[PDB]
């Protein structure tokens, strides 16, 4: 029984788009007398950044019980409804947004949303709540964020540089040499000390495994991102 | 359903303080004291401080999509308070200063009630919850209300991207003249288009999702580039 | 019966931590079919600033009806559950965070939390209290409290107003002399007009009693904290 619907957008709160979305959903639900809880994950995803969105979805969703998750972030086409092994429904565009969250929870079926209607996502999400599921044209694959090439995965509110590299891929207190190439060609090489906490090796750059299992580059009381001029997608090379 | 179950909140309180929480708290406190079950939705709390033009535009964009319900909006540079019942039963609670202008017009005003002393941020809250409990409101009626003049063409609101939205609801290189507050006038050339992608080299104007003529600049902030703010006069020619 | 649970953090929403916390609680809640409202008080508390948090909690909570409140801000770990006279429960670090709210509501009992499980602990412990409508464990005698006898800066407004420790206990319109000692050591002396509204005396620095009953320093349409360069915990002396 589907009970929760979550929203994750890059709309911001300066506008009233998010509110509209809640209104639509809320309207449909009341018309079919379907009680459900609307939960906000985040509306501060950086405009058009599917990677940022992908990372926040990966961090929040797995902690919810089976439920519906609407995520609207697309720098513009294709849009899907994903069904997870355990029965989670992921509403949103087909551009990679759900890549990580999809793998984590397991893909059971990919159903293409058909134009029988932006505000599509909201409606589709509500529909899934009332009908407690969704049916439609099953699809072969889905657009997926290439996870083979190591790069800057996400950037913190503090400016910490979160990488692709998972704990299971990295051989403590040793000195690592991280190479970072920006999209424009400039290349930066730094020396980090793989530690356990943020309060360690305060004098230099440090890298540790964060609460999501990825190698992250940080600088005590600073903003490594701004210090290295590192942006999303920069190529990472450890050695 | 003819039962009031939803109540939204729109403010310029921000989240740095606990005023928003205190408001949700008082609402909940009252709803419990009458075992009234209702959902509380936030539309936005990032309305620019004291800017009723920003609020009015946000309310217009979100409220129409909700089913009949109560909506508390608190943005006001210090007075006269009101409850507005729309045609389809919606209830708008807030200051009588033009805040509810656009939304009230699109939902049709059934009646405007005056809020007495009978009872402040924690005042629009009690009223909104009271409406939920009694499934309605009553008071001395008001003939007309304060309204944001929509006949004088000016900057309606400013996007998070810096886009300049005018209250111009046209025909078509457009030439737009702006009269800032101080009196200085600027004149720019816009390429009237359909999407934000077209004509990247120069300024562009277009009709946005809300239906108003909007000025923008590819991946940049027109508002800052032109130094345009709320209420600047617009003149197309 | 406990039906409401509020969240107050310094997590922000650039990340999915707040979402994971909502899901976590919801998950436990849907596993005992316990229905409850998850209210958001604020997630924009300044990172590690417990003074900021303590102030927000004092402002919002007393207006709620008896319920549960999870507040997560701590630069560090001792964890507690404060039970109020009227049945409110405060859940979070024993570092002074709940100092003001605790006194206002009145303490019935402070219970230590046995690490038999930190983002998740407070979450789990909160839902748990909702499911059982109460808590139990080793009782603690006293908690850490923010020293309120030491006159200083309580909080800083979003406008930049300097909120002080001094409660509603000189006269109106008089000219108060205020000395402020920063952390660095330097002292600043300013003259203030004790008024009753932010609009009066738009020329000089003014001070007044804010909606929380505290003496506040403000400057019409300007940021008092930035102008005087005042930070949290700066010592305040009136003469």
Swiss-Prot record, chain A:
Instruction: List the catalytic activities from the record.
Output: (R)-S-adenosyl-L-methionine + H2O = adenosine + L-methionine + H(+)
Care to name a GO molecular-function term for this sequence? hydrolase activity
Positions that bind (R)-S-adenosyl-L-methionine: 160, 198, 211, 216, 221
Give the similarity note.
Answer: Belongs to the SAM hydrolase / SAM-dependent halogenase family.
Q: What does this protein do?
A: Catalyzes the hydrolysis of S-adenosyl-L-methionine (SAM) into adenosine and L-methionine. Does not have chlorinase or fluorinase activity.
Amino-acid positions noted as binding adenosine in the UniProt annotation, renumbered to this chain: 10, 74, 160
The residues annotated as site (Important for activity) are 74, 77
Gene3D superfamilies membership: Bacterial fluorinating enzyme like, S-adenosyl-l-methionine hydroxide adenosyltransferase, N-terminal
Q: What is this protein called?
A: (R)-S-adenosyl-L-methionine hydrolase
Recorded hits in Pfam families, A to Z, give:
SAM_HAT_C (PF20257), SAM_HAT_N (PF01887)
Recite the UniProt keywords alphabetically.
Answer: Hydrolase, S-adenosyl-L-methionine
From Swiss-Prot, chain C:
Keyword terms, alphabetized: Hydrolase, S-adenosyl-L-methionine
The residues listed in the UniProt record as binding (R)-S-adenosyl-L-methionine, with positions renumbered to this chain, are 161, 198, 211, 216, 221
EC number(s) stated in the UniProt entry for this protein: 3.13.2.3
**Positions in coiled-coil regions:** none
Q: Where is this site: Important for activity?
A: 74, 77
Its domain of life reads: Archaea
What InterPro entries is this protein classified in?
Answer: SAM_HAT_C, SAM_HAT_N, SAM_OH_AdoTrfase, SAM_OH_AdoTrfase_C_sf, SAM_OH_AdoTrfase_N_sf
Per UniProt, what is one GO molecular function of this protein? hydrolase activity
Which Pfam families does the protein's record reference? SAM_HAT_C (PF20257), SAM_HAT_N (PF01887)
Q: Where does adenosine bind?
A: 10, 74, 161
- Top EC class per UniProt? hydrolase
Q: Which reaction does it catalyse?
A: (R)-S-adenosyl-L-methionine + H2O = adenosine + L-methionine + H(+)
Share what the entry says about its subunit structure, partners included: Homotrimer.
Function, as annotated, reads: Catalyzes the hydrolysis of S-adenosyl-L-methionine (SAM) into adenosine and L-methionine. Does not have chlorinase or fluorinase activity.
Family stated for the protein in its record: Belongs to the SAM hydrolase / SAM-dependent halogenase family.
Protein name in UniProt: (R)-S-adenosyl-L-methionine hydrolase
The lineage is: Archaea, Methanobacteriati, Methanobacteriota, Methanomada group, Methanococci
């Amino acid at each position: 029984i589907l009970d929760i619907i979550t929203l994750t957008t890059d709309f911001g709160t300066n506008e009233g788009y998010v509110g509209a979305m809640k209104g639509r959903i809320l309207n449909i639900l009341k018309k079919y007398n379907k009680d459900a809880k609307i939960i906000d994950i985040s509306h501060e995803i950086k405009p058009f950044n599917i990677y940022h969105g992908a990372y926040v979805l990966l961090t929040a969703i797995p902690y919810f019980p089976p439920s519906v998750h609407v995520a609207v972030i697309d720098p513009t086409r294709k849009s899907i409804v994903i069904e997870t092994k355990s029965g989670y429904y992921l509403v949103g565009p087909d551009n990679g947004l759900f890549t990580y969250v999809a793998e984590k929870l397991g893909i059971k079926r990919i159903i293409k949303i058909d134009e029988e209607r932006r505000d599509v996502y909201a409606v589709v999400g509500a529909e899934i709540l009332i009908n407690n599921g969704y049916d439609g044209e099953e699809l072969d694959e889905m657009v997926k964020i290439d996870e083979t090439k190591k790069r800057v995965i996400h950037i913190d509110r503090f400016g910490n540089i979160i990488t692709n590299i998972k704990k299971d891929e990295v051989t403590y207190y040793d000195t690592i040499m991280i190479k970072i190439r920006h999209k424009n060609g400039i290349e930066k090489i730094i020396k980090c000390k793989f530690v356990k906490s943020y309060f360690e090796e305060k004098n230099n750059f440090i890298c540790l495994i964060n609460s999501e299992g990825f190698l992250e580059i940080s600088k005590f009381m600073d903003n490594a991102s701004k210090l290295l001029n590192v942006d999303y997608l920069d190529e990472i090379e450890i050695e």
